[PDB]
Amino acid sequence: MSMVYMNIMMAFTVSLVGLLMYRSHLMSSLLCLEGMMLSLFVMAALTILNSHFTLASMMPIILLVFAACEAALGLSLLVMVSNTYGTDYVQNLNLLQC
Amino acid sequence: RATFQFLPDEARSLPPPKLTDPRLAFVGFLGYCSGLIDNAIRRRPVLLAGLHRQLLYITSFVFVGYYLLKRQDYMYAVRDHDMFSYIKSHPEDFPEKDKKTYGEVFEEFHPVR
Amino acid sequence: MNPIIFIIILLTIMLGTIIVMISSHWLLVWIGFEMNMLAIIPIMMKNHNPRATEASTKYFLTQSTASMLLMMAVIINLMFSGQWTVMKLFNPMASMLMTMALAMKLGMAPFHFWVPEVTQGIPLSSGLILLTWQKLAPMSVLYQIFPSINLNLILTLSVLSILIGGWGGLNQTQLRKIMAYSSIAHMGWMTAVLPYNPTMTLLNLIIYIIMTSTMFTMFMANSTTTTLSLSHTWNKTPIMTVLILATLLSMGGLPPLSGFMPKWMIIQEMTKNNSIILPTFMAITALLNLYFYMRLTYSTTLTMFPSTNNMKMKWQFPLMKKMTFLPTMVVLSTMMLPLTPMLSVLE
Amino acid sequence: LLDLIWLEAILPKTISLAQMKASTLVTNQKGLIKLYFLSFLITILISMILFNFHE
Amino acid sequence: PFFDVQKRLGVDLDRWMTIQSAEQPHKIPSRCHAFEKEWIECAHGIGSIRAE
Amino acid sequence: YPTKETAHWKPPPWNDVDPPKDTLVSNLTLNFGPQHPAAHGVLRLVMELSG
Amino acid sequence: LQYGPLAYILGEKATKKMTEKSKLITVDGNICSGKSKLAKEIAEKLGLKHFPEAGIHYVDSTTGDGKPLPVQFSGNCSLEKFYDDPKSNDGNSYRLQAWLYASRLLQYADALEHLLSTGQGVVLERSIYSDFVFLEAMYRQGFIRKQCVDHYNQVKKVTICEYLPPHVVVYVDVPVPEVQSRIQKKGNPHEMKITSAYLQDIENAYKGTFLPEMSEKCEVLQYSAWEAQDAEKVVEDIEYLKYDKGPWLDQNDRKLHKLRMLVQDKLEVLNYTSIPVFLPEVTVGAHQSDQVFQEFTELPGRKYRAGYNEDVGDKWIWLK
Amino acid sequence: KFYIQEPPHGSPNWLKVGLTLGTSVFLWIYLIKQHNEDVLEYKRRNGL
Amino acid sequence: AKTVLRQYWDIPEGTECHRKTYATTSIGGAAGLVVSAYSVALKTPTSFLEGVARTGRYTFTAAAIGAIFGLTSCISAQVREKPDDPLNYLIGGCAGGLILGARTRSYGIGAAACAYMGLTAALVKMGQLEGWQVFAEPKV
Amino acid sequence: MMLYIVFILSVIFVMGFVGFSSKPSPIYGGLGLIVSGGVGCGIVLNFGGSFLGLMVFLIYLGGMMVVFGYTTAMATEQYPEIWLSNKAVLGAFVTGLLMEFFMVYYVLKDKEVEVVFEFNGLGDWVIYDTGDSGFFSEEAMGIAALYSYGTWLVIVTGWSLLIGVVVIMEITRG
Ligand SMILES: CCCCCCCCCCCCCCCCCC(=O)OC[C@H](COP(=O)(O)OCCN)OC(=O)CCCCCCCCCCCCCCCCC
Ligand SMILES: CCCCCCCCCCCCCCCCCC(=O)OC[C@H](COP(=O)(O)OCCN)OC(=O)CCCCCCCCCCCCCCCCC
Ligand SMILES: CCCCCCCCCCCCCCCCCC(=O)OC[C@H](COP(=O)(O)OCCN)OC(=O)CCCCCCCCCCCCCCCCC
Ligand SMILES: CCCCCCCCCCCCO[C@@H]1O[C@H](CO)[C@@H](O[C@H]2O[C@H](CO)[C@@H](O)[C@H](O)[C@H]2O)[C@H](O)[C@H]1O
Ligand SMILES: CCCCCCCCCCCCO[C@@H]1O[C@H](CO)[C@@H](O[C@H]2O[C@H](CO)[C@@H](O)[C@H](O)[C@H]2O)[C@H](O)[C@H]1O
Ligand SMILES: CCCCCCCCCCCCO[C@@H]1O[C@H](CO)[C@@H](O[C@H]2O[C@H](CO)[C@@H](O)[C@H](O)[C@H]2O)[C@H](O)[C@H]1O
Ligand SMILES: CCCCCCCCCCCCO[C@@H]1O[C@H](CO)[C@@H](O[C@H]2O[C@H](CO)[C@@H](O)[C@H](O)[C@H]2O)[C@H](O)[C@H]1O
Ligand SMILES: CCCCCCCCCCCCO[C@@H]1O[C@H](CO)[C@@H](O[C@H]2O[C@H](CO)[C@@H](O)[C@H](O)[C@H]2O)[C@H](O)[C@H]1O
Ligand SMILES: Nc1nc2c(ncn2[C@@H]2O[C@H](COP(=O)(O)OP(=O)(O)OP(=O)(O)O)[C@@H](O)[C@H]2O)c(=O)[nH]1
Ligand SMILES: N=C(N)NC(=N)NCCc1ccc(I)c(Cl)c1
Ligand SMILES: [Mg+2]
């Protein structure tokens, strides 16, 4: 494939690894989720734009809309996690082992 | 054959299940059992309470079961219609054998000594 | 939650699932999953306690991750075919990513870790939706993409799910965690037969849903969530202990009950394709599920556990729970084996 | 020696012990988001490198 | 689709955007329009197993 | 099956509610004045703020 | 319609039935402190429903034909046996206290259901909020083990959290020496065996823990023995209260609907009073439980759901 | 015995009883005429 | 795994044992690493050094079981001049079980391993001979 | 050098991703996502999608403004971590850059590169269309069709956004 795809696919993989390798802050992982969607938007936009798939030009826009619904949903849960424990640390969410 | 149709039109060329179908009698029986369980979980007299409710359990089961049995019969008719037509379309894959008798075919004998 | 808001949110859970099942376009399939995930989270958080918050968070992170892998597969598929039709995929890398994406959505092993924890952290009514309705959409996608799925991958997931589900349930005293590991074990049977006969995947899915709905409804009827709390049922409602016994023996797959039907038809399809070792391994490993079903029947119906004095107060009040469809569901869960040939309705 | 011991040991008692051990390995988890998702990365990597599920 | 309600009801929900050779605004063609048309018409009705 | 790694596991609450953490979200403390246009130059208003 | 989400959607909202007179009032005090009389007079003057203090046979009064049931259908817990032998080996002391709390929990749910569904306030004599004083007195005198106290607290912490405290807490402060004389005049031979130290422990819990707690969230009125002798003066105080604190200010139709769904479902109310915690004082063996349960179902009008017992004249069973 | 509180199901709910019986009757008639219709269509299509 | 598995099955039974032992060792070592990775990921080691210690302990145990099975099964075939006899893998399978038992300091594990590994390995050779399919390709 | 404009921007795209993927303080992660969103807009714009590029930049700028606010409220510590402050963050950061730098170095040297899959390094312009002369923007025609062809898409997206408001109100009402 064209060389641009090497870096966009690489960017998606970097964010996927960033998502799967947690640290403490839950906000940091939510950012990696937003980054994953950004690479998908760009990767989809390139294909659609380059192939002149006219009606598919709206598809990346629709992608962003449900990205915001996910980010808003993620932030809502972060608020509740923060209220319970006073931090957004993911090590506090370990009550359900038992 | 018709896309997302419970009973295609061609299914009407098959005979409908009889209303005395043994399978339909069993379905009606399951409705009767459901009615009894309904009384029991709610701590009502199992056999006597709410005969109107018990009637509707039997009737609803038989109603739904009749259509399921009709589609069931239809899908097996379709399977055979497909299978036989395919055999007709490909004779060379289903060749008729020459049937030897047992006086000609050699089978080995294994004594039970 | 306002009752009207609860109904609107529930209908949105169903609308997202319906969209997935009726869509011919990969983008609308992805939208259906996203809409479904958005609506279910408030049902998980309905009681607002730290365990519900933890459960919803773990659920959101898992499902959101799966959707990104799902959309990655769709875009890779678009590059290598230039279309969006929901059908076989045209790139093996896309097939793997989509297959993993659906495995995480279903909670199949080794993507299973969330299922026991999320189920434990949410009420029983929400757990019922999670372990039943939420299986429909991912399975409906596997039903359409299986001609391009890697056989080794899908059978590996099925094998691991049956083992981990069976082993995982042996150590559980919490009912919601018992149902969760049971669900993992049953997911494996559905996907094991998918490469050979998708019609048998639907049959197992439908029968699993009926039996799983029956159990959850009976747990809700008595507000029981632990083994010991359920062991008091013989002193409140004796009839409910017999229904639990019949349903649990059915989930174990014992003839002549209904739950034997899917295990039986799956073994038939696998043997027709010269798969002998795998169904044998699967049937024996399902004995682990029967074991921890049998423990529940012992503590619930076939013995009488110690009671408490305050239990006498409950004798004077009737069951008020709705228990919707329980009489029908329990009969279907148990007495359906004579009608096995009706599986052709799913063809 | 046989009926109360060895015929028990080499089958029901050994099998049930193995299942009990495996159950403990499966279920003894920390309930930590970080560890579960770190195992997802391992699963994905071995899927491509060892078993070539992506080909 | 798992359930083909679109066909049963004869309503077009999403198949207008499934392929790039479908009707586009102002009849703007995709770059691979001819190639995909030829492939779609070759494989029409015979099934994937044969079309492969 | 008790094990060493689960010796510290307790049965969950009967009603699913874990007790609220005693964690203290500290209020922000701010020197409002003396050197401040609204403090009249000599007021050291020590204010605790949440937001 | 039986109450539920559908009834709520159509307009059955508590804010429509509640007024300034829809109040929950609890009269508390020591034994033989004049609670009953004062509570009954407050209820009659204000137009509220009076609930006599929940006893062993309270639940019987709300089910069946309303008569007390034989004592085996309450565990044989006896108040008289508690007074005679407060250290009975058979655990009667705690078994009684656990039973009484559950009876009060049920009475509180019934009271709340009445308040929410009709808007008429109620008057109670003691409640789940004040029942613990008797548990503290029992423990300080050695009548129950510490394990019983731990059990009691577990049951309380998962039940009292679900309800709203009473609007008004009326308290009659009668000092112990006067209480002992009052008991001596009352004439119940078992009740005369109460030690004064036990009575002082009831008073120490009331003054030490109960009232300081209720002050934060309820309107508390304390009346000496003589002030309580005129309920008309008590009613006058209640009529001019501010009602400026407590959780009732924070309630709305959405919350009172959820609360009403709980209290109308009595098995849901009593769910955690039988947690599987095996104390000897409250654990019952299977053979005893099975036998008593069978006898209970052989009582008149108790075999089937209410309205399906033909042994007591229910009709149209085949259509009901 | 004579209940202290009037039972919720103390008397039949005649509106439900009518609906329940009316539905059972309706479904039964619908089933029978369908079966008769199918029998006649089946004979027609097969030259019987 | 397909490449290493193919190499093992491409050199005839009983011939070129050293090459066989490399294949079974390669399979064993990989299996041990897979076990270490999940173990380290899901049961965090207290120190980086220990996590390495756990990794080497599992990878060596796994590789030993592979090498001894590959050595025993080939040497038994060559010695007995019975290249295509399932019994050779039974000898190799049990020997592996003993190595596992030794590495665990548990006779009972060693006894059970020698059996179940013995049967499982012998079952694999029959499957190769008769074409038993584990992940059978769909056909009908 | 200008013929490789999309490649250069895509290199910065990855560098921004390594930025926030190594997970320093979310303050700096948001900075890395803004840079990536900025150059990502530049990449899409250079393929003829001016509206798509500017829109994704605009959305992500609004999103990272909220994330900033939530960070100072709910994801802050006494010593927020930069990339150099933490050993795990630095190791991931360096590893990302070295993996990136080696992909770039070899794809430029050989005009091709195998990184798992084969990528051609002739420059990204080679795949572009050769004959355009319409009096409109094809991306604008495709996007505007959402309101004539995408009735179904409009309904499901509009409904999801409304439900989204209802849901976040439910989720955060303790
Ligand atoms: C032609 C009919 C052939 C019968 C086939 C039976 C097959 C099993 C059907 C299962 C459904 C049974 C009905 C649901 C149970 C409800 C009955 C109950 O709960 O208790 C018995 C009850 C009498 O007790 P009571 O509660 O006081 O009610 C007063 C009414 N006289 O009510 C009664 O008076 C008795 C009602 C039936 C009792 C059934 C007992 C359980 C049977 C299950 C065992 C398994 C069945 C055999 C397996 C082979 C199947 C052929
Ligand atoms: C696969 C082969 C086997 C075939 C399996 C077939 C299964 C599907 C068949 C349907 C299964 C459910 C049938 C339930 C029958 C019992 C209904 C009944 O008696 O209701 C009594 C009454 C409510 O009846 P009512 O709503 O007034 O009637 C009008 C309905 N439009 O009031 C009551 O007391 C009802 C309470 C008990 C019922 C449980 C709660 C469910 C509520 C259902 C409402 C009524 C549904 C009407 C069913 C019609 C189905 C054709
Ligand atoms: C049909 C062809 C296909 C074949 C598949 C098999 C069909 C059978 C499916 C069964 C479906 C479940 C319904 C079974 C109905 C059982 C009825 C029953 O148990 O009697 C009710 C009674 C409840 O007590 P109660 O309502 O209060 O009455 C007064 C007594 N206290 O009960 C009791 O009081 C008993 C309490 C003690 C518990 C004893 C438990 C041992 C007896 C269990 C028998 C049922 C086993 C069913 C399992 C399948 C059997 C094949
Ligand atoms: C012969 C080929 C096929 C055989 C298949 C047999 C599978 C196993 C069936 C029985 C499973 C029973 O599972 C469990 O076994 C152990 C002993 O074995 C029992 O436990 C009993 O023995 C063990 C050890 O001897 C003791 O530690 C324990 O105190 C005692 O109660 C359990 O009460 C039973 O629940
Ligand atoms: C041919 C295949 C046959 C497959 C048969 C189906 C297998 C079903 C396996 C069920 C295994 C669970 O069964 C479990 O076994 C162990 C025996 O070690 C029992 O454990 C018992 O013995 C062990 C040690 O001997 C004690 O530590 C324990 O206190 C005691 O309870 C468990 O009480 C039982 O729950
Ligand atoms: C033809 C190919 C043959 C391939 C053979 C593959 C064999 C399978 C090997 C799986 C990995 C080894 O399996 C692993 O070994 C180590 C041995 O230390 C065991 O470890 C156990 O024994 C020792 C001593 O107690 C310690 O390492 C450890 O504390 C303990 O848990 C693990 O419990 C086991 O899970
Ligand atoms: C705890 C018990 C777990 C279940 C145990 C079940 C054991 C079942 C045995 C595995 C199946 C048989 O094992 C597998 O058979 C196939 C034949 O189809 C062999 O297939 C082989 O055949 C040719 C030779 O003709 C080889 O050159 C080639 O490398 C390979 O394709 C595999 O090399 C073997 O690995
Ligand atoms: C914050 C850090 C940011 C890091 C950003 C990293 C950017 C990545 C570097 C990309 C460099 C591209 O480098 C580009 O390679 C091609 C190779 O054909 C060169 O193009 C070349 O083509 C012809 C070949 O016939 C030569 O005659 C010509 O002299 C030369 O220009 C460009 O002159 C050069 O600019
Ligand atoms: N052990 C115990 N006894 C209780 C409890 N509640 C009431 N009692 C007893 O029930 C009897 C009646 O209670 P009281 O109302 O306080 O006594 P009284 O004679 O009626 O005096 P009045 O306040 O005027 O009504 C007393 O003997 C109490 O000790 C309780 O929770 N535990
Ligand atoms: N095995 C599959 N994947 N498909 C499948 N069920 N093939 C079998 C063919 C079949 C069987 C029964 C019927 I009735 C019909 Cl009509 C067709
Ligand atoms: Mg009194």
Tab-separated table of N, CA, C and O and ligand atoms in Angstrom, chain C residues 291, chain D residues 8 11-13 15-16, ligand 4:
chain	number	residue	atom	x	y	z
C	291	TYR	N	-21.487	-30.323	37.456
C	291	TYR	CA	-21.082	-30.452	38.849
C	291	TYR	C	-21.581	-29.279	39.679
C	291	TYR	O	-22.232	-29.472	40.710
D	8	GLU	N	-10.018	-45.888	43.874
D	8	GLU	CA	-10.455	-44.515	44.089
D	8	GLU	C	-9.394	-43.510	43.662
D	8	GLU	O	-9.712	-42.497	43.033
D	11	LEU	N	-8.502	-42.493	39.782
D	11	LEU	CA	-9.560	-41.949	38.944
D	11	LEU	C	-10.337	-40.852	39.670
D	11	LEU	O	-9.968	-39.679	39.542
D	12	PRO	N	-11.402	-41.153	40.424
D	12	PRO	CA	-12.225	-40.049	40.947
D	12	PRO	C	-11.468	-39.069	41.827
D	12	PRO	O	-11.714	-37.862	41.743
D	13	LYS	N	-10.553	-39.544	42.672
D	13	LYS	CA	-9.873	-38.649	43.602
D	13	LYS	C	-8.804	-37.817	42.918
D	13	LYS	O	-8.555	-36.676	43.323
D	15	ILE	N	-8.918	-37.017	39.565
D	15	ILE	CA	-9.591	-36.131	38.622
D	15	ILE	C	-10.181	-34.935	39.354
D	15	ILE	O	-10.025	-33.786	38.931
D	16	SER	N	-10.857	-35.186	40.474
D	16	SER	CA	-11.524	-34.107	41.189
D	16	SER	C	-10.526	-33.143	41.812
D	16	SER	O	-10.825	-31.956	41.956
K	4	LIG	C1	-13.923	-44.381	36.482
K	4	LIG	C2	-13.812	-43.423	35.262
K	4	LIG	C3	-14.838	-42.280	35.385
K	4	LIG	C4	-14.812	-41.712	36.828
K	4	LIG	C5	-15.512	-40.326	36.850
K	4	LIG	C6	-15.702	-39.912	38.299
K	4	LIG	C7	-15.647	-38.368	38.391
K	4	LIG	C8	-15.686	-37.923	39.878
K	4	LIG	C9	-17.091	-38.200	40.456
K	4	LIG	C10	-17.149	-37.771	41.975
K	4	LIG	C11	-16.886	-36.281	42.154
K	4	LIG	C12	-17.073	-35.958	43.676
K	4	LIG	O1	-16.358	-34.747	44.032
K	4	LIG	C13	-15.900	-34.718	45.338
K	4	LIG	O2	-15.019	-35.886	45.596
K	4	LIG	C14	-14.428	-35.810	46.954
K	4	LIG	C15	-13.658	-37.079	47.153
K	4	LIG	O3	-13.524	-37.720	45.927
K	4	LIG	C16	-15.463	-35.630	48.061
K	4	LIG	O4	-14.786	-35.164	49.290
K	4	LIG	C17	-14.536	-36.162	50.207
K	4	LIG	O5	-13.232	-36.820	49.875
K	4	LIG	C18	-12.115	-35.841	49.915
K	4	LIG	C19	-10.854	-36.546	49.620
K	4	LIG	O6	-11.071	-37.931	49.719
K	4	LIG	C20	-12.021	-35.172	51.286
K	4	LIG	O7	-11.038	-34.132	51.244
K	4	LIG	C21	-13.329	-34.578	51.710
K	4	LIG	O8	-13.205	-34.171	53.083
K	4	LIG	C22	-14.471	-35.544	51.592
K	4	LIG	O9	-15.691	-34.849	51.853
K	4	LIG	C23	-16.495	-34.599	47.727
K	4	LIG	O10	-17.595	-34.721	48.674
K	4	LIG	C24	-17.033	-34.734	46.340
K	4	LIG	O11	-17.929	-33.636	46.076
